[PDB]
Inverse folding.
């Protein structure tokens, strides 16, 4: 049912998300499982030796394997095509220090595969190199993702920067009435409460309930987008006493597919907090946790496919994502507690976005 590579990409990106979620247990996190898989799929082409092994081992595939590069290319083009209706602004980029002899033939080879190019910049001009990179990222995200590199992120010694940014403000197939949006009490994991804008809509929603292995029931709702291609999945334990982590730790691309397959439409009243999350994740620690350590270590990093004439290592590997959820006697579903969301491309089964709303 899913694309073989879409599954590999999604499963990989999900494992990375779980690493971020475990690190920031009680903070908001919005992440792109597909984005991180994609930028790391590209990194495979620049990477060699042990550094490549670690990435390949973690992703479950080699950009080397036959048809693997086309597959990703087709997947991307499928996700970003006009037929989707619901726009997704995304960008990735490898920035390399200028005046470093690159492996003759790599540039055009990288382009033939991913239809992107490696950008060369002078990190010597720290603040200029930083603006060049940030303005690129903003320019290629409808101007939505700004300042992806904060002051200090890069210095005159930076030689390789890895960047990925996404913005999504989708429009629901069935919109929430503006009039129903009101301030409502949200219960945070620590037991405290804040009053936040929540949307309300009675409709025949896609819904189903799963149990955690330990037997805790949790609600899952699917909110399709007007393009009939993407869907948001909202999931959270029914019992507030059960932490959201109980879901995040069992999460997988495959589980989400089962959620979808078990959905039935039922007259429901959904109260869902209106929210706008922006998050930058430093991919280093999460990726290191998954066995990919070489790529960040100066002289141990093997990027000999990109440049064998001079040592390289990733100074920064950063993803920044902005997601906005807005308006665009039946059973009552109130998301007044920390919950997961998943944005999914259903035709391919790709997990584009994933996040936890710990505090709207
Ligand atoms: Cl919680
Ligand atoms: Zn299955």
């Amino acid at each position: 049912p899913p694309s073989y590579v879409a599954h590999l990409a999604s499963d990989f990106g999900v494992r990375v998300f779980q690493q971020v979620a475990q690190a920031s247990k009680d903070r908001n996190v919005v992440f792109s499982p597909y984005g991180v898989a994609s930028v790391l799929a590209m990194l495979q082409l620049t990477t060699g030796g042990e550094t490549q092994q670690q990435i390949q081992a973690a992703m479950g595939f080699k950009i080397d394997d036959k048809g693997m590069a086309p597959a990703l290319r087709h997947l991307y083009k499928e996700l970003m095509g006009p037929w989707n209706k619901d726009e997704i602004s995304t960008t990735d980029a490898i920035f390399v220090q200028r005046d470093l002899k690159l492996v003759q033939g790599f540039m055009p080879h990288f382009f033939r595969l991913f239809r992107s190019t490696v950008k060369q910049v002078d990190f010597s001009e720290v603040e200029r190199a930083r603006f060049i990179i940030n303005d690129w990222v903003k320019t290629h995200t409808k101007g939505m993702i700004s300042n992806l590199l904060g002051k200090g992120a890069v210095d005159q010694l930076t030689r390789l920067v890895l960047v990925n940014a996404l913005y999504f403000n989708g429009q629901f197939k069935t919109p929430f009435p503006d009039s129903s949006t009101h301030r409502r009490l949200f219960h945070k994991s620590d037991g405290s409460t804040v009053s936040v804008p929540m949307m309300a809509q009675t409709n025949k929603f896609n819904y189903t309930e799963f149990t955690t292995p330990d037997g805790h029931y949790y609600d899952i709702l699917e909110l399709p987008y007007h393009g009939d291609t993407l869907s948001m999945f909202i999931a959270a334990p029914y019992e507030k006493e059960v932490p959201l982590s109980a879901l995040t730790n069992i999460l997988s691309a495959q589980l989400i597919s089962h959620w979808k397959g078990n959905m039935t439409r039922l007259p429901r009243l959904l109260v869902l907090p209106k929210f706008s999350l922006e998050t930058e994740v430093d991919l280093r620690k999460p990726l290191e946790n998954l066995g990919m350590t070489d790529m960040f270590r100066q002289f141990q990093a093997d990027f000999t496919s990109l440049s064998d004439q001079e040592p390289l290592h990733v100074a920064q590997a950063l993803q920044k994502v902005k997601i906005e959820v807005n308006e665009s006697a039946p059973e009552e579903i109130i998301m007044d507690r920390p919950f997961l969301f998943v944005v999914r491309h259903n035709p391919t089964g790709t997990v584009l976005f994933m996040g936890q709303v710990m505090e709207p």
Q: What stands out?
A: The CA atoms of residues 130 and 160 lie 13 Å apart.
